[PDB]
Amino acid sequence: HPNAATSDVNVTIDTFVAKLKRRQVQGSYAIALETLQLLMRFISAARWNHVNDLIEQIRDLGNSLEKAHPTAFSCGNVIRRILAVLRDEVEEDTMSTTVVAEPLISSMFNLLQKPKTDYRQVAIQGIKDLIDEIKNIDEGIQQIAIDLIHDHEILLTPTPDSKTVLKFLITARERSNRTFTVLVTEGFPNNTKNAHEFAKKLAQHNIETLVVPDSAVFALMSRVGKVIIGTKAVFVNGGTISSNSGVSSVCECAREFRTPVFAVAGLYKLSPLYPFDVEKFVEFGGSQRILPRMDPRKRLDTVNQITDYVPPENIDIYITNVGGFNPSFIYRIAWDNYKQIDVHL
Amino acid sequence: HPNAATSDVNVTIDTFVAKLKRRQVQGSYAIALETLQLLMRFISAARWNHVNDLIEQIRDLGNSLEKAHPTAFSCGNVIRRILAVLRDEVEEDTMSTTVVAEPLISSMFNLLQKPKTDYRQVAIQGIKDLIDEIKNIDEGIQQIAIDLIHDHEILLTPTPDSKTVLKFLITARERSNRTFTVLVTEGFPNNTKNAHEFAKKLAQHNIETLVVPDSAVFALMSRVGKVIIGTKAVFVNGGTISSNSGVSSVCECAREFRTPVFAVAGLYKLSPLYPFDVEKFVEFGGSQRILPRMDPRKRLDTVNQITDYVPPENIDIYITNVGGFNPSFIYRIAWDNYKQIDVHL
C-alpha cells in the first residue's frame, strides 16, 4: 500500500523517512524507539475492527520501511516482533470465536497439512512491554556476563560505540578484584572519535587503557586472552555485522591463534534474514575522511567500507538478557520470537 | 669380523659391552666419554702399516659396537666424527703422495667422475677436540637461549631428564630483569622422580614452580607461551628421540594450539643415520613398576616404554653450541661433521 491515507492521520512518518534516508537519526536503539512510537501512533488514532487486513497493512508498512533503508534492520525486527505478538493472540482469539496438542512449542507438519474484545488494550500493552525490554537489557545481561572474566587476562575490544557494551564493561570494572587490561582499536574511517571517547570513559572509571592501531593485530594476539565485540546486527547462521571498521581481519587472526570470542547481542537486534553474499549486505564508506583534493583521485581509486560482516566460523559466545548462546544455535532463539512466513514481506 | 684379533692388545671392549647390556653406564655423555677412551686406547696400542685397512678395521669395530647396543647413538656419532676427521687428512695426504677445483666445500659430481705421514698425531688431536666439545655445550647455547623468553610469559616443560635443559633454564632464570612462570608435566612411569627433583631445584632457585599432572595439560593451554623438549638424540630429517615419557602428546597439543616448540641438545647427540622405524630404535621399559602381583597379571598385559619419538613437523628450532638451526637445515650440520661414506658401516 502506498502513502496516500498515511499522511494526515499520522504526521511524523515523513520525518522518520527523512531521518532514515539522510541519516538524521543516530543509534539503532533510537531508531527502534522511533519505530515503536510510530506503531503506537498508528494504533491509537486509526480504527480498524477487522484484524487480518490490519495485519497485512502493518506488514506492508514494515516492508516499505525495509525497502527505504537496506542497512537498518532494527526497525524491521521490532515490527516483525510486534507482528508475531499479534499473531499468537489472534490465533488464540479465533479458537474462542469458533466456540490439538503439540509435542514441543512448535510443530513441523502443521505447515503442510490443513489446520468485541480488549485486543486493542493487549496490543497497547505489548508496545509498552517492548519499550521496557529495550530500556532494560543490561539488568538481564549482568548476572550471566560477569561469570567468565578472570584475573590477569588481557581483553581486546573492537568496535567501541554502543552504550550497552560500555555499561557491561563498567559493571565488570566496578568489581575491583577482577583484573583486566583493555586494548582499544581506533578504527580508521569512522570509529576514531568514538574510540577516543570510549578510552576517556575508561580512564574516568580508572581502567587500564591501551590505544591500538589497526595494523597491530598479529603482534598482540599471542598475549590477548578474550575478545569482546559490540555488534549492531545478528543473523541466522551465526555471522554478525559489527559497528564499522576492522572486524573481519581481527576475527581471522583470532581464529588462527585460537582465541575465545565474546559478543554483546540483543534479541531485538537479532535478524531472521539470511546473509548469502558479501556483495549486498556490506555497506561501503566515504573517501572524504581519508584524503583531501580530487585531482589525484582521477587515476587513483580509494577503497573503504563502514559496516563490516563477519563469518560465523570465529565467534563463539552471544551474551543476551536470557543468556549466552552458540552461533550454531542462535537460529532457534530467533525462531522463539520470529516466524518463517514473516521473513519475506 | 670377530674379537679374535683383539684379545691382549685391547681388552676393554668386553667391559664396554657389559656396561651397555646390563645398564651399568648411565647418561649419553658418559657413554660418549667411554667411547672416546676406547678409541684412544685403540690408537695408542695397535699397529697399522696400511691406512685403508686400518680404516676398514675401525669401521668393523664401529659396526660391532652398534650390534652390541643400538640405543647408544652418541657412541656411534663420536666414532663417525673421528672417521670423518681421519678421512680429510687422508685425502690431503693422497694429494701430496701423488705429487682440483670445487664450487663449494663439497661437490656431487666428484662421486660420478673418476678421482708415510704423521696422521696419528692429528687423529689423537681430533679425539681431544671431540672431548673438549663434549665438555661445554651450554656456554655456546646461552648467548642465543636467553633472548627468547620474555616478561609475563609462561613456559611448559616436558622431559626434565636432560641435564642440559635444566642448565639452560637456570641460566635464563639468573637474570633479574626477566620473570616467567613454569609449568612442569610429570611423566608417570619413567620421569616422575626426575620431574620431582627438577621441581625441587626450581624451588631452590627461587622461581614460581607449578607441578602439573599428565592429565591437566589441556586446561592450562590457553596461557601457555613456549614449549621446550629434553631430547636425547637428534637425526637427519629433524626427528628426535627424547629422554623418556610424556613428550609426544604435549608436542601434539602445542602443534594444535600453534605454540612454539624449541629443542636443546647438542651436535654430539646428532646422528647421520635415518630413523626409518620407530619400533627399531625406541626401547621399551618394565611392566613390574606399574602394577603388583603376578598370577592375575598374566591376564593383564601392560604396555610401557622408555624413549619417545616426535615427528619433525612439530619442532621448529634446534639451538646448539654453534648457533640456532632448523629441522630443514640440521642435515647439513651433520654432513659438516660426518662424511658421506661414513654413514654406512
UniProtKB/Swiss-Prot annotation, chains A, B:
Keyword terms: Cytoplasm, Initiation factor, Protein biosynthesis, Translation regulation
Q: Where in the cell is it found?
A: Cytoplasm, Cytosol
**GO biological process, any:** cytoplasmic translational initiation
GO-annotated molecular function: enzyme regulator activity; translation initiation factor activity
Top-rank taxon, per record: Eukaryota
* Record SUPFAM superfamilies: NagB/RpiA/CoA transferase-like (SSF100950)
Q: What would be one Gene Ontology cellular-component term for the protein?
A: mitochondrion
InterPro entries named in the record:
eIF2B_beta_subunit, IF-2B-related, IF_2B-like_C, M1Pi_N, NagB/RpiA_transferase-like
Please give the subunit comment from the record: Component of the translation initiation factor 2B (eIF2B) complex which is a heterodecamer of two sets of five different subunits: alpha, beta, gamma, delta and epsilon. Subunits alpha, beta and delta comprise a regulatory subcomplex and subunits epsilon and gamma comprise a catalytic subcomplex. Within the complex, the hexameric regulatory complex resides at the center, with the two heterodimeric catalytic subcomplexes bound on opposite sides.
Query: Any further remarks?
Result: Present with 6650 molecules/cell in log phase SD medium.
Instruction: Outline what the protein does.
Output: Acts as a component of the translation initiation factor 2B (eIF2B) complex, which catalyzes the exchange of GDP for GTP on the eukaryotic initiation factor 2 (eIF2) complex gamma subunit. Its guanine nucleotide exchange factor activity is repressed when bound to eIF2 complex phosphorylated on the alpha subunit, thereby limiting the amount of methionyl-initiator methionine tRNA available to the ribosome and consequently global translation is repressed.
- Family stated for the protein in its record: Belongs to the eIF-2B alpha/beta/delta subunits family.
Q: What is this protein called?
A: Translation initiation factor eIF2B subunit beta
- Organism, as annotated: Saccharomyces cerevisiae (strain ATCC 204508 / S288c)
Which gene is this protein's source?
A: GCD7
